[PDB]
């Protein structure tokens, strides 16, 4: 069951991803890599103020249709 989420950055640029609720956070980072050419190891994702950890899953943070993730590019 596909669904669509948004990823936003500090510059206000927004991209749209198609994802599954069981998709691991590293799959999300690889989809960001597909769109933006940014390596997974050079990304941080934030949802609801908390960091999305590698090896976990989108549902583990209760991320659902049309949620907006925040892509951090300075750490």
């Amino acid at each position: 069951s596909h669904m669509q989420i948004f990823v936003k950055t500090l510059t206000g640029k927004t991209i749209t991803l198609e994802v599954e609720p069981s998709d691991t956070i590293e799959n999300v980072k690889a989809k960001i890599q597909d769109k933006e050419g940014i390596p997974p190891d050079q990304q941080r994702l934030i949802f609801a103020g908390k960091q999305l950890e590698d090896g976990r899953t989108l549902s583990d943070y209760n991320i659902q249709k049309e949620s907006t993730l925040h892509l951090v590019l300075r750490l």
Binding site: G12, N27, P40, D41
Partner: protein
């Protein structure tokens, strides 16, 4: 063509000078927008005792929104955007990466004597290091720990980074033998290639060794490559093949910005290796299997300036195989220079100052003002 090389080097010198002096401002983002968005992302970090508004200031003092990105991918996107223009960058994005050959020759043959931009993406081989015995009743791919080997009584499977189950092609006889030989409690859920495990010691330790050999052979045909680093190389046209230089440009996660790379002149220091010397180090990075040489070359090519010798030691030793990939495209110096000049006027117009440090500080206080007001109006 004597003096012919200096119109590409002017492109190099301009982007280097502007990134050095202006940092995040070279992206052309107005300070207001930066402050507004930082505000929306920051609301939840506020202390809401006292007059929250005075700790809103505490939040704005806490802001780092004008410090430049240190994502290697984002810095590459910005170099591509400035030198090729937005549309040129979008066409470059469509062309495919090439795996650097063993001796680097495919990249050297892709650098004719014109002004060239190289984009590199480097992958690290992220194979499983861990295994566990499990019963089929208890194994749920969605919840189980990922990038791990699962030994069942009749199957050996690999649960990859995307949570997909990959059978490793073993008979149920072999799996039953392996499952029933590994009986010690602290070897039920362990690591795959332990140097202390001795196949001649025990039936259990020979089964652990054999499983590692199986997994290792199977991983050779499984795609475990994950992109780890990204950078660009500007290669200006030169007056003679043997005097041609390249200039690598990079940021690096949690380590340094492209501004800092330029301030320490690492682009120039690496430029002194020549094209063949640099390519040879880049090619060795991927062919060697000596983790100390891999780490030493990684350190030399990619550390912030001055940390070449500590960057990949200790905790940060490079144990996994790397693979360099590249793509090349031509740069029109008129387009890249016009791009840089439009950004320069934007900065001079909207953030005037007698020196570059003052323009940067004016930009920062404008962004802070816009953040302060937005956070004020929503609390």
């Amino acid at each position: 063509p004597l003096g012919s090389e200096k119109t590409g080097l002017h492109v190099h010198e301009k982007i280097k000078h502007m990134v050095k002096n202006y940092g995040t401002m070279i992206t052309g983002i107005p300070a207001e927008i930066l402050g507004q968005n930082e505000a929306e992302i920051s609301v939840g970090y506020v202390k809401k005792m006292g007059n929250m508004k005075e700790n809103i200031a505490e939040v704005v003092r806490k802001s780092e929104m004008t410090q430049p990105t240190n994502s290697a991918g984002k810095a590459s996107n910005e170099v591509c955007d400035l030198l090729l223009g937005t549309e040129g960058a979008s066409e470059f994005e469509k062309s495919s990466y090439q795996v650097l050959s063993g001796d680097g020759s495919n990249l050297k043959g892709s650098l004719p004597n014109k002004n060239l931009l190289v984009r590199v993406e480097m992958d690290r081989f992220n194979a499983p290091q861990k295994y566990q015995k499990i019963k089929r009743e208890e194994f749920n791919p969605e919840t189980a720990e990922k990038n791990k080997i699962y030994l069942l009584e009749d199957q050996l499977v690999y649960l990859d980074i995307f949570g997909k189950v990959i059978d490793l092609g073993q008979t149920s006889d072999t799996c039953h033998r392996l499952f029933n030989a590994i009986t010690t409690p602290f070897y039920q859920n362990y690591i795959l290639y332990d140097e202390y495990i001795d196949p001649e010691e025990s039936a259990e330790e020979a089964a652990m060794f054999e499983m590692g050999e199986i997994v290792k052979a199977k991983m050779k045909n499984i795609d475990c490559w994950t992109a780890t680093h990204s950078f660009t190389i500007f290669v200006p046209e030169s007056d003679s093949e043997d005097t041609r230089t390249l200039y690598p440009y990079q940021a690096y996660w949690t380590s340094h910005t492209l501004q800092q790379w330029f301030s320490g002149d690492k682009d120039e220091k690496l430029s002194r290796l020549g094209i063949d010397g640099y390519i040879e180090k880049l090619a060795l990075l991927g062919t060697t299997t000596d983790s100390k040489i891999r780490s030493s070359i990684y350190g030399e090519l990619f550390s912030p300036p001055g940390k070449e010798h500590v960057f990949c030691t200790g905790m940060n030793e490079k144990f996994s195989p790397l693979r360099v990939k590249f793509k090349v495209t031509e740069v029109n110096p008129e387009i890249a220079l016009q791009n840089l000049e439009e950004v320069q006027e934007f900065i001079d117009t909207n953030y005037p100052g007698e020196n570059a440090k003052d323009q940067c500080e004016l930009y920062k206080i404008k962004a802070q003002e816009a953040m302060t007001k937005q956070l004020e109006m929503r609390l």
